[PDB]
Structures are given as structure tokens and as C-alpha cells.
Amino acid sequence: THKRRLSALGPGGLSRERAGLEVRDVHPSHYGRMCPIETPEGPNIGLIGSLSVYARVNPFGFIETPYRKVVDGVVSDEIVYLTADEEDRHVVAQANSPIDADGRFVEPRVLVRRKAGEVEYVPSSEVDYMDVSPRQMVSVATAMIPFLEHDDANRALMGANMQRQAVPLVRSEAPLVGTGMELRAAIDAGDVVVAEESGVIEEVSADYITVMHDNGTRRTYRMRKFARSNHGTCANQCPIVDAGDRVEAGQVIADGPCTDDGEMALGKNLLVAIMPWEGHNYEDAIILSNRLVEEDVLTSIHIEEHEIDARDTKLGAEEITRDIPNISDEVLADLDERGIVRIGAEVRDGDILVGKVTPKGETELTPEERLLRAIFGEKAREVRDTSLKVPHGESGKVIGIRVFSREDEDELPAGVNELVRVYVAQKRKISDGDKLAGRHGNKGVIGKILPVEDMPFLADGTPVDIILNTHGVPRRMNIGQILETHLGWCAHSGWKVDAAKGVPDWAARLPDELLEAQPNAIVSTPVFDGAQEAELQGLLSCTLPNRDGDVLVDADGKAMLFDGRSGEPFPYPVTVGYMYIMKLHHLVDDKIHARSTGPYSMITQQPLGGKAQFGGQRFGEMECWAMQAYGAAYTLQELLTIKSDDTVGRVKVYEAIVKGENIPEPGIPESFKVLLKELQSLCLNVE
């Protein structure tokens, strides 16, 4: 979904601040061409959208959409691709209309869409087009939400935008309840190795699959193992065929990052209760069980890349070597004899990766340091020390080292003698502060990870895995997250609709081979044609027993949970089920920052910004208004002088803190004396 994206901003298009309210809204001609649900959430709503499933681009650049033409009230199959101009000249029926076995509508009047966007109700002779399917108005990412038509459009927007931010886990279990769009959004996205021509598997291994075709030659597919993605996530790729299998053309032959048996698997299936538990799941926060940390249910692999280069300077050449200026022999234990670290050496925050030393030319020492050299007998060592150390807060193993050199004819830019990149792996568990999210726009950070002993367990002793809150369900209008909680229980345990005297009345319009199902069966509810509300109530009344004859969930969908912490049961039953949750890429380890004293800026001496540098948090305008409205003069004067600009006050405060004295009076901020110079350079006698 980064391809198939229709953006309105850019060169030759409109701007982000000069864009009115007219282009952002959904025109009625967007049906079947752009999705009304999926769009960004920030200051870009309406400016960025995505194509539909069945859309197609004209040779002129307009967007087409298929329709089934109906002649004399009989729906044919001559599929015509209309544009938005000539769609309005005709009338277009609705896809979920009762066609009776020939093409004839059952009811004499059909729902229909007229020229200006009006929704009429017209008799079945003026109708000349029908949709080719439901879910035609909806995009690729939006069509992977089960029970879409029970969510509000804001929450469906957030659910479609939080599916493209999930990380690839290390196990990647397929969803227990989905739509039909998982299998096709994986083999078309290209991150799955697909067998080209029909053959028979000759040799499989974790690096390569050689298949033998029917006509002579073989073909070897090379899997990419532990490649770094553009965003740090892992790109592992494992086969799913054995060494004797017969394959066909187009068959999935190796899984990808977020796939399982060829279909998309963004998260995991977890047992969920909807009780509010002790104020830890308070106002969108989520509490977990400790089983997901012990068994690596939500563990991901993150790969970082660090790069350094030895150039030619004006004083000589920067050299990559183990001979580093004055430093201990303990911090040189992992470096080999030619600079860079060893593969497999575990690093932490502050360790040296590439030993690089740059010539310094000349400076003269202080008398104290020149005395300190003469006592211990150490030379001046005029070359500097600019090594490559890992940034603050990172750690992990070392996967690979890629080194390009001028001496081996590699392509490097002008005046670059050597260029070495080092990859660092890190296996991240789940932790409180990480952001999980469901499929239906519900989300929230982990506030607590309880041990498995104090966690509400069922009558089996099986504890639940997550505990979501009640109060976030009714006011957000996304109760589809309840319905997949119910069906996900049925698909966990399997049903058997006892038609021993006749098929019951709720299952009259069910297909066959949904009358019974083995446990852990994967089902599929499509987008606008799925399980009705009157069939979940039927499948909940047959929910086949676990190991002993013991129905754990009654007809309402709720179960009787014990208390893991006190022991006595909760007085009322509680909805349990199986939800499919995903681990988003808003982890805590990328967000936490702290700064005592770091780098300062160039012209005005205020601190820098951002976690890439050190950077201080911006105490802007509205925070100053709040501190003035408090009446705290001294905290405001301290935040604005001796913490940003008072250049002689900065080191004086540091000295007074270390020696343990009182904090001195602030001076004048050095960003105000820049203003006097820029006003005097405008020919204004500011005195």
C-alpha cells in the first residue's frame, strides 16, 4: 500500500497548508476508485488516498471501474470498465441484490445510484449496470478487516492505518478469523518466494531451494536470511516445502516476514477478557500475561546499520587501525588486528566498533598536561581519536561487516579511502510502554505485565492472555471487535450444528461444510458479506467441549472466570474470546530520551534537538504562559537563562552542583545579544 497510493501534493499539485476543505471530502464519484476509509490521520486527510481493489487506469490517466451490464432486467456477464464521466449517464444497481438464477431481480424495485450521487429506489427495468462485487469501494488494506460494517468510519480508518505499522514477529501465526484478502495480498506484494514453473522439489535448505522442472533444467531459489529492511525490521525468509514435494506454477514455496503458509499474518491470536481489572487497563491501556514473554509470542528482531568512512584530509589520511590514542587495553578486547569488531561480539552503549584515528597536526598543551606527560612518561600522540562507537541506548550482537576499499577497486566517492558498515542485531521482547493494537482501530500501550499466577483463569485453569477494557467499547462504536471475539472462540473450539432432524432456521442460508468444523479451524468473513448477527448466536450455542465434557462459554458468549489474585470467582460472567492483535512499531526503546548536558548549536548557543543528537525538550511559548500564570518567576528564569543561553552561567552551575555550593544568579542570555547585533546591522541605534 505504499504503491497504489494516490497523493495530491507534490510538484505541480496543491500544497498542504494552501488546501481547502473541498478537496479533502469524499466526492460521490469516489465509489470504486478511491477508498473513503483509508487515508492518513494527521494534516493530510483527503490529500493522500489509495486505489480500490478492482480499479484500473485509463490511457489518458482517468480511473476505471468494472460493472456488469444488465439487459431487460437480466444481469449478463459482459464486464464494462466505466470512467467517472459516463458512470453518471447511466444508472448503477447494488451488488447485494437478489438475482434469481438467470439474471432477473427477485423484487421488482432495486436500490440504485443516480447521476448526481442520489440514492433512489427504481423499478427493475431502467437498471443497466450492477457492481461486480461488494467491497468494491474499499482498498486493499481496508478489505482485511473482519466485520467492517459494524465499525464507525473513524475507527475503521485507524484500523486500516494501524495494519501497515505492525512489526514482523519471529513466529508469525496466521489469523483465526479473517477476510478473503489475506492470501492475495501476500503473493502479489512480492515478499513471498513463488515457484515459477511446475516442478518437483529436489533439494531444500534454509538458504536455497533447487526444484527440478518437468522439461530438463533445474532452478535454484535463494532465500534472503536476516536482511535489514528500510525501517530496521527483519526480512527472514524460510521454506515450507520438503525434499520430495510436487509443486505447481504459482504455488507459494517460501514464507516471508509476516506470512504463514502463504497468507498474511501480522499478529497473533490471544485469549482476551473484556473485564476492567483493578485499574491497570484504565483509559485505553492494555495489560498482558507473562506467558508472552516466556514463550516469545511477541518477540521481534531489529537490525541497525552503522557506517564510517576513512577519507583523505588536508593534513594526511585517516587510518582505520587498532592503534588508538590514549585508551585502556580492556576496551580493545573485541576489535581484531585491522580495526573493526568481530562477528558475534556483543556490544553495548559506548563500545568501539571501528577503530579510526585522524591526524591532528598541531596544538600546544596546557602546562599541567605537559607536566602530567613528563611524570608518567607518555608521548603527545598528535593524531586525534574519532572512532565509531554505538549511540546511546543501543546494544546487541553483530551480524555482518561490509567493507569497501579503494585498494580493491570498489566504487566509492572522491577522497574516500575506506567505507565500512556494521550491522547490529537485537532481539526485542515485549515490554510495558510498547504499543499493541487490534484490527478494529482499538489500540493502547501495555501498562502492566502480570505474572501467570495472578491473572483471571477459566474453569480449566487456563489463564487469559490480554485483558481489554469495557469502557472503550461502546463510546467508540467499533463493536466489531466484540464479534470477532465471539467467532474467534468458535473457530478455536469448533462447532457442530446438529441437523439430525433438520437444518435449523438460523443455518438455512449458511453454506455446507460450515455445519461442523474441527478445532483451530480458520474461517473467513468477507467485508460486506460475512457472518450475520443471527449466525454468531447460533454457532455460540454449539461450541464443542475441550478435553472433558465441559462447555466453557455459554450462549451469551461470556464465561465464569476465577480470580488469580484472591481466589474466589468474579460475581458475574465475563466475555472471553480470541482476538487477533498486532505489535506496532512504536516501541519504548526508540522513544525514551534523557539529557543532562550535550551538544549546543552554532549561532545561538541553545541546545540541539532530537534523539539522533542529544537535544533538549523544547520549553516553548505555551509552557512559558503556564509558568507565568502559576507565578513561578524563578523556575522560568532558570529554564530560560542558565539552561539555554547564559554561556558563563552554564559551566558555573555545573561547577556549583559538583562542588556542592549554591546555584549562582543568572546573567544575560546570549541569544538576546545576537538580537542587538541583528538590529544594529539594520541601521537602528538600539542602545
Binding site: 504503491k3 497504489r4 486505489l51 481493489v53 478492482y54 480499479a55 484500473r56 487506469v57 468494472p66 456488469r68 456477464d77 464486464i79 451488488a95 447485494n96 461486480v132 462485487s133 461488494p134 486493499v140 496466521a174 479473517g178 478473503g180 484478502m181 492470501l183 492475495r184 495480498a185 503473493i187 502479489d188 506484494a189 512480492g190 509443486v247 505447481e248 506454477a249 504459482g250 504455488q251 507459494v252 503458509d261 502463504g262 497468507e263 442460508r509 449458511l510 453454506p511 461444510e513 460450515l514 468444523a517 479451524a521 480458520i522 474461517v523 473467513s524 468473513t525 468477507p526 458479506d529 460475512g530 457472518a531 449466525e535
Partner: peptide, 27 residues
């Protein structure tokens, strides 16, 4: 459906569709 090594995932769909999903990267 019409993919040879697919997992058998049962559907609740009450309708059939004439046109299948195109080659999604054809834009």
C-alpha cells in the same frame, strides 16, 4: 480459490463474484 497450494479457509460468503481480484501491482 484458484491458487494451488492455498490453505483451506472456509468462507461465510453468501454471494459469488464474476470477476476475480486483478494483478494488484498493475497500476
Amino acid at each position: 480459490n484458484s491458487v494451488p497450494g492455498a490453505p483451506n479457509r472456509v468462507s461465510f460468503a453468501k454471494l459469488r463474484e464474476p470477476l476475480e481480484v486483478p494483478g494488484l501491482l498493475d497500476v
